[PDB]
Design a protein around this nucleic acid. Sequence first.
RNA 1: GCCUACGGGCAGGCGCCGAGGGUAGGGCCCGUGACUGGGGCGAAGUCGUAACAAGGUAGCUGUACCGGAAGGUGCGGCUGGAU
RNA 2: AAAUUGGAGAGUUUGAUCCUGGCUCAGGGUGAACGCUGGCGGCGUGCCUAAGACAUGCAAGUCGUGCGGGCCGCGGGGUUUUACUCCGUGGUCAGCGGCGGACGGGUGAGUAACGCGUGGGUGACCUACCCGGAAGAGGGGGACAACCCGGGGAAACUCGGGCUAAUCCCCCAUGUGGACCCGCCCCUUGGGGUGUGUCCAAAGGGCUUUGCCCGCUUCCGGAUGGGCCCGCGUCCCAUCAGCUAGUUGGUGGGGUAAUGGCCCACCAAGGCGACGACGGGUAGCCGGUCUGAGAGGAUGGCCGGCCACAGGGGCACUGAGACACGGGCCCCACUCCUACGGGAGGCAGCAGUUAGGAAUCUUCCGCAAUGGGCGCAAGCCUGACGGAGCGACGCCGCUUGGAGGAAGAAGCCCUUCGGGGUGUAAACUCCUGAACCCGGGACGAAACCCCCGACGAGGGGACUGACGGUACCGGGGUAAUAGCGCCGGCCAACUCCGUGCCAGCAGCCGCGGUAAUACGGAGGGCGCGAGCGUUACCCGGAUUCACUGGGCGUAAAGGGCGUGUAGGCGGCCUGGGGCGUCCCAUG
Lengths: 85, 103, 62, 208, 104
Amino acid sequence: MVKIRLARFGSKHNPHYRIVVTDARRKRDGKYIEKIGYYDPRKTTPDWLKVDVERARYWLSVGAQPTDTARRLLRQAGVFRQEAR
Amino acid sequence: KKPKRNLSALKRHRQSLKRRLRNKAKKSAIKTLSKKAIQLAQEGKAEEALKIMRKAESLIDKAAKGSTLHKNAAARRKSRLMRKVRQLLEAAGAPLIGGGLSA
Amino acid sequence: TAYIPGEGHNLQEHSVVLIRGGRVKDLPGVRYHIVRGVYDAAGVKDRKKSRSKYGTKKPKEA
Amino acid sequence: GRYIGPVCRLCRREGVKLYLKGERCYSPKCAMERRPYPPGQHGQKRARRPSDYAVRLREKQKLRRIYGISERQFRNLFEEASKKKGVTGSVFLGLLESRLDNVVYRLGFAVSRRQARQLVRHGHITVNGRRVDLPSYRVRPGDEIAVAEKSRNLELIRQNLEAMKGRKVGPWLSLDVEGMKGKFLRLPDREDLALPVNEQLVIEFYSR
Amino acid sequence: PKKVLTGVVVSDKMQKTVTVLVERQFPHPLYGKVIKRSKKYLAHDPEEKYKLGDVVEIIESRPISKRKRFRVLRLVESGRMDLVEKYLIRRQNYESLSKRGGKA
RNA sequence: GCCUACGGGCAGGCGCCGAGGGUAGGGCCCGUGACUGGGGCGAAGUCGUAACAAGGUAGCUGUACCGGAAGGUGCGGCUGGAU
RNA sequence: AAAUUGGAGAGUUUGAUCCUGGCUCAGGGUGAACGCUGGCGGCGUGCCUAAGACAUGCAAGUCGUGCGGGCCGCGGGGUUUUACUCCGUGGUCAGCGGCGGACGGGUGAGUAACGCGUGGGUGACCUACCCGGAAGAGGGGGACAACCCGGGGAAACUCGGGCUAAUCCCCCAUGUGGACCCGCCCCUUGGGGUGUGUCCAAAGGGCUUUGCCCGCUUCCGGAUGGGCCCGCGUCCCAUCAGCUAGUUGGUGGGGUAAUGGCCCACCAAGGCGACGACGGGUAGCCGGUCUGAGAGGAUGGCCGGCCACAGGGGCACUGAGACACGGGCCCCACUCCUACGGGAGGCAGCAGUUAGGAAUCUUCCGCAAUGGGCGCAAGCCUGACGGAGCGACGCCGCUUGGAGGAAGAAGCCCUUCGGGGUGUAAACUCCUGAACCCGGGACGAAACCCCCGACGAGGGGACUGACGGUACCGGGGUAAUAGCGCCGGCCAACUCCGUGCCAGCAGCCGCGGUAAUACGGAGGGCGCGAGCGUUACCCGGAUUCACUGGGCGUAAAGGGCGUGUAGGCGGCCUGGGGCGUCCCAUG
Ligand SMILES: [Mg+2]
Ligand SMILES: [Mg+2]
Ligand SMILES: [Mg+2]
Ligand SMILES: [Mg+2]
Ligand SMILES: [Mg+2]
Ligand SMILES: [Mg+2]
Ligand SMILES: [Mg+2]
Ligand SMILES: [Mg+2]
Ligand SMILES: [Mg+2]
Ligand SMILES: [Mg+2]
Ligand SMILES: [Mg+2]
Ligand SMILES: [Mg+2]
Ligand SMILES: [Mg+2]
Ligand SMILES: [Mg+2]
Ligand SMILES: [Mg+2]
Ligand SMILES: [Mg+2]
Ligand SMILES: [Mg+2]
Ligand SMILES: [Mg+2]
Ligand SMILES: [Mg+2]
Ligand SMILES: [Mg+2]
Ligand SMILES: [Mg+2]
Ligand SMILES: [Mg+2]
Ligand SMILES: [Mg+2]
Ligand SMILES: [Mg+2]
Ligand SMILES: [Mg+2]
Ligand SMILES: [Mg+2]
Ligand SMILES: [Mg+2]
Ligand SMILES: [Mg+2]
Ligand SMILES: [Mg+2]
Ligand SMILES: [Mg+2]
Ligand SMILES: [Mg+2]
Ligand SMILES: [Mg+2]
Ligand SMILES: [Mg+2]
Ligand SMILES: [Mg+2]
Ligand SMILES: [Mg+2]
Ligand SMILES: [Mg+2]
Ligand SMILES: [Mg+2]
Ligand SMILES: [Mg+2]
Ligand SMILES: [Mg+2]
Ligand SMILES: [Mg+2]
Ligand SMILES: [Mg+2]
Ligand SMILES: [Mg+2]
Ligand SMILES: [Mg+2]
Ligand SMILES: [Mg+2]
Ligand SMILES: [Mg+2]
Ligand SMILES: [Mg+2]
Ligand SMILES: [Mg+2]
Ligand SMILES: [Mg+2]
Ligand SMILES: [Mg+2]
Ligand SMILES: [Mg+2]
Ligand SMILES: [Mg+2]
Ligand SMILES: [Mg+2]
Ligand SMILES: [Mg+2]
Ligand SMILES: [Mg+2]
Ligand SMILES: [Mg+2]
Ligand SMILES: [Mg+2]
Ligand SMILES: [Mg+2]
Ligand SMILES: [Mg+2]
Ligand SMILES: [Mg+2]
Ligand SMILES: [Mg+2]
Ligand SMILES: [Mg+2]
Ligand SMILES: [Mg+2]
Ligand SMILES: [Mg+2]
Ligand SMILES: [Mg+2]
Ligand SMILES: [Mg+2]
Ligand SMILES: [Mg+2]
Ligand SMILES: [Mg+2]
Ligand SMILES: [Mg+2]
Ligand SMILES: [Mg+2]
Ligand SMILES: [Mg+2]
Ligand SMILES: [Mg+2]
Ligand SMILES: [Mg+2]
Ligand SMILES: [Mg+2]
Ligand SMILES: [Mg+2]
Ligand SMILES: [Mg+2]
Ligand SMILES: [Mg+2]
Ligand SMILES: [Mg+2]
Ligand SMILES: [Mg+2]
Ligand SMILES: [Mg+2]
Ligand SMILES: [Mg+2]
Ligand SMILES: [Mg+2]
Ligand SMILES: [Mg+2]
Ligand SMILES: [Mg+2]
Ligand SMILES: [Mg+2]
Ligand SMILES: [Mg+2]
Ligand SMILES: [Zn+2]
């Protein structure tokens, strides 16, 4: 099953993650289907999370179950939020 | 002097043998019974050959719904058997039963 | 066959030694040198100059 | 490490004044003032004509020695300077001059470049309000280079800023004597630096 | 796009099949001259329709036999024996070139 | 022989393919090696003095024969042969 | 692969000279090793050899919300000799069953191949779990473990009998729908539709029980992951020139998810090769990396992509997926147990042992993070992974002080005995304050969950750190490691002494036979600096394989001469085609 998860790309003691779509089974840092924004757990910058909503929305729309930390990060950039009445 | 144990691997083997047998049985039932079919068509026995061909057809489709065959693999043999029968009641006379065959 | 460099050595009929590249023009059919200060090849004694090339350690009180 | 050892001596091998020392490099003591020949047994004897290598080499050394600096840090900058859009000869000096150790000295906080490196390394320097102690940190334009609030009271800090009473600071820089701050305004164009180096010879030495 | 090549028939002697000789020109990867390399394709002729000397188009196809992976596509130009000759004489000369021996 | 709803299934038995082995007979590649060919060398001696001067019989060359060897001669060829 | 951003040579054949030409050096690089030396940190990185052998420990499990039961107990009941027996429950064990075990991890043996790269094909195909859409889950019966009973074996294990539960197995029905034969319509390789005949489904569990949650069934599409096929590219030897008989094609049949000599039977005599078949050698391939002005050469650990193997060789079984590293069956070689009938085992997973070798690490910490498996969840598992450790193995950063200080102490060295050198160097004066001491002290971690709200959005709440008492901050605070090569020319750096063709140096030319700037020591100098040298290897220099960019009268080099095959190449005008070629757009 396709997942939306994190791929570490930092250094040692410098974790820098990358939100990605990929087949369940690939190496944590392997060939990924599509990148959908980065995430920096230490917040060394005013912009330690970007997402590109509309893509992620697409991928969820064909059931790319995302990991737990990923759902959280997605939620935070409001991939899930609706509106009004 | 102790062959370290892997309980859930062996368990898998345990089951594989079970399945293997179940699978053989269904498969073989088809073999001899499809043979019954094609045989009795070369003796021009349409009331009987089609009687069988249908029991063959069913037994075939059943091992498809399980894991003995694939939906195609079954389908494959239904096409073998059925056609191989019609083209044997050319060599003789009219399909009595109607059976599993269309005109 | 291997050149033994250095003003005087201590090699013998069963010395275990180490050898490197480096021909000697004057001695033909000699395309290897013996490394000094490894296995059974002492460094040169008394050598005070190009010491690392002869396995001699740096002497005190000099 | 960096070079520690006798200096008025390189002053002499390069045959020009490097100002590696400080208060006396200006006095009648630099031995250039007393023995303008190179060090050693043979510096008295008339020279042989230099090979091209010789002149290329020495002009490199003269420049490098002026600035403190290891050859590995030096070559790595010349390398960086060639990768730059610019006239590398100039781009180089601009890069050199961008060193904190140097910026501090040019600012007039330290008597000399050597004394400057300590002032940095022992933590006496602010960069943009924070502490910096790598003499290799690169100052960019817009940077403010202050004395630590702590180290404000040193004899040499105060004694040196009182020479600023009558010096004026480089044209790409601004000093706030009273406030003990300096600002780095832009990179020094070649014409600002007036070193006794033929930068081009340096370049040539490296293209071998 | 299923690949499509153009070439000539050099062989009848196969059951439902023709040998097609396809030329390709291209500049040499180092010396940049244009060089004329060639290849033989085995093409499914379900009707014997294509005779030798025919130039034909040939198209990438669901596998037929071990070597047959192309179907004969259409006729380009028929009767063209000069080419076939060049194939055969190139071949004939091979029986020279040996080392077991020759004659007078 | 076992199970059965009597349709058939299971054990078991045979057969092809088959890893591998057996006999014979070839071909190939490395390890060691009795006995051997010259060869290049490398210290300055033996016996010659062929070549370099027309080198004291112009030189070289293919092919022969002689000679342990250097060379000699025969038959041609060449000038890269001196007055 | 967006300023034409980029290109150095020297020594050596001669008495001298010009050319030819080989040799050699300076540069850059390394998964390095060896010598002398070695203070600190950050990030990388560390068996290149025997794909040799491997002790021990761990490396893939999980679900009690699919199902029954053994053992050890706890409660709480009913009751015929006070033994039985009903209910709930803790702990533990495995079994039946579902899912994972085909991912993740290692290695580079094999392979010169559709293996890889690159672009395409699939009307010749499959795809568990996830997503959307449509439809349904109605009856009936059945077997094997666990368990109890009994027999063989030294062991490993093993056969027999009897009981039984399920989301396990099996038959009947409804069939939205699908599968198969046959016919028609469109389409065109086996694609879509349609009509009669046949044939095919299903399972239950939980609770906040008159409806929610998890799961079940057939089918249509998405999504993702794979099979197969084709064009083009893919090292050396022609002192390997012919190779092939399942070989090449056909027809039919088997097998598969599917094409195909992939397999089998019968028929035909084909298939490939000098554009290098076949044979021998070597090698995993690439994104990249090293070098280079480029072109090119060289290389493919570490990261990522594909492949291949799991002690050698076969083979299939389960299944969506394997012909499966820690699954199965057989043969061989090896090691161990053995009662000599037989059995056990597979680190090229992490760490480590051992051999081999010039040489390559800790039997460490942690599941806090990311990722993966199983589960409603809590959680369980995870040597994937996150970290620490050891090694200057590499790069980068930091230190061993800073300022003042003599016409210039001593000692050592040279001296023409006047003096010169180390050398502001030292001493000595002030200043700073690595180390270290005390105090504070992280980010990485907020979700899963629980509550409100609807189970959604959204809001509130709690738990959780291996690194690590680390980084970092504040205060205090000591002058506090320097070594290695080199100094005849290339090539930065010169004197004395010893030695006497000796000892020795030596990359190359060469040096040394009593005045050695070349051996050895010393003073002095040059070059780098926690590093410096050496060896090995790649590229460079080497327009010295010359595409860019070379040659052949005498330097190495024109076939002894012709004939002519394949091939290469080819006049002037006009017109068509548009293959090469060129331009644009797009992938
Ligand atoms: Mg750390
Ligand atoms: Mg995969
Ligand atoms: Mg055999
Ligand atoms: Mg003579
Ligand atoms: Mg003569
Ligand atoms: Mg004579
Ligand atoms: Mg005679
Ligand atoms: Mg004659
Ligand atoms: Mg000569
Ligand atoms: Mg000479
Ligand atoms: Mg260069
Ligand atoms: Mg090097
Ligand atoms: Mg040591
Ligand atoms: Mg090993
Ligand atoms: Mg290895
Ligand atoms: Mg073990
Ligand atoms: Mg469940
Ligand atoms: Mg209980
Ligand atoms: Mg259990
Ligand atoms: Mg793997
Ligand atoms: Mg081969
Ligand atoms: Mg492809
Ligand atoms: Mg499954
Ligand atoms: Mg299933
Ligand atoms: Mg669904
Ligand atoms: Mg529904
Ligand atoms: Mg029984
Ligand atoms: Mg079922
Ligand atoms: Mg149809
Ligand atoms: Mg039914
Ligand atoms: Mg039931
Ligand atoms: Mg045949
Ligand atoms: Mg066929
Ligand atoms: Mg190999
Ligand atoms: Mg070049
Ligand atoms: Mg390149
Ligand atoms: Mg390669
Ligand atoms: Mg890897
Ligand atoms: Mg790799
Ligand atoms: Mg092994
Ligand atoms: Mg195997
Ligand atoms: Mg496995
Ligand atoms: Mg495999
Ligand atoms: Mg293993
Ligand atoms: Mg290991
Ligand atoms: Mg050893
Ligand atoms: Mg997790
Ligand atoms: Mg790790
Ligand atoms: Mg370190
Ligand atoms: Mg070392
Ligand atoms: Mg450093
Ligand atoms: Mg004196
Ligand atoms: Mg000082
Ligand atoms: Mg103090
Ligand atoms: Mg925290
Ligand atoms: Mg936080
Ligand atoms: Mg919250
Ligand atoms: Mg948790
Ligand atoms: Mg609620
Ligand atoms: Mg503390
Ligand atoms: Mg402090
Ligand atoms: Mg203080
Ligand atoms: Mg000190
Ligand atoms: Mg040099
Ligand atoms: Mg010099
Ligand atoms: Mg020396
Ligand atoms: Mg020398
Ligand atoms: Mg000397
Ligand atoms: Mg000295
Ligand atoms: Mg010195
Ligand atoms: Mg070249
Ligand atoms: Mg050319
Ligand atoms: Mg030439
Ligand atoms: Mg000649
Ligand atoms: Mg010649
Ligand atoms: Mg001629
Ligand atoms: Mg000739
Ligand atoms: Mg011609
Ligand atoms: Mg032409
Ligand atoms: Mg023309
Ligand atoms: Mg024309
Ligand atoms: Mg025209
Ligand atoms: Mg056109
Ligand atoms: Mg065109
Ligand atoms: Mg073109
Ligand atoms: Zn000075």
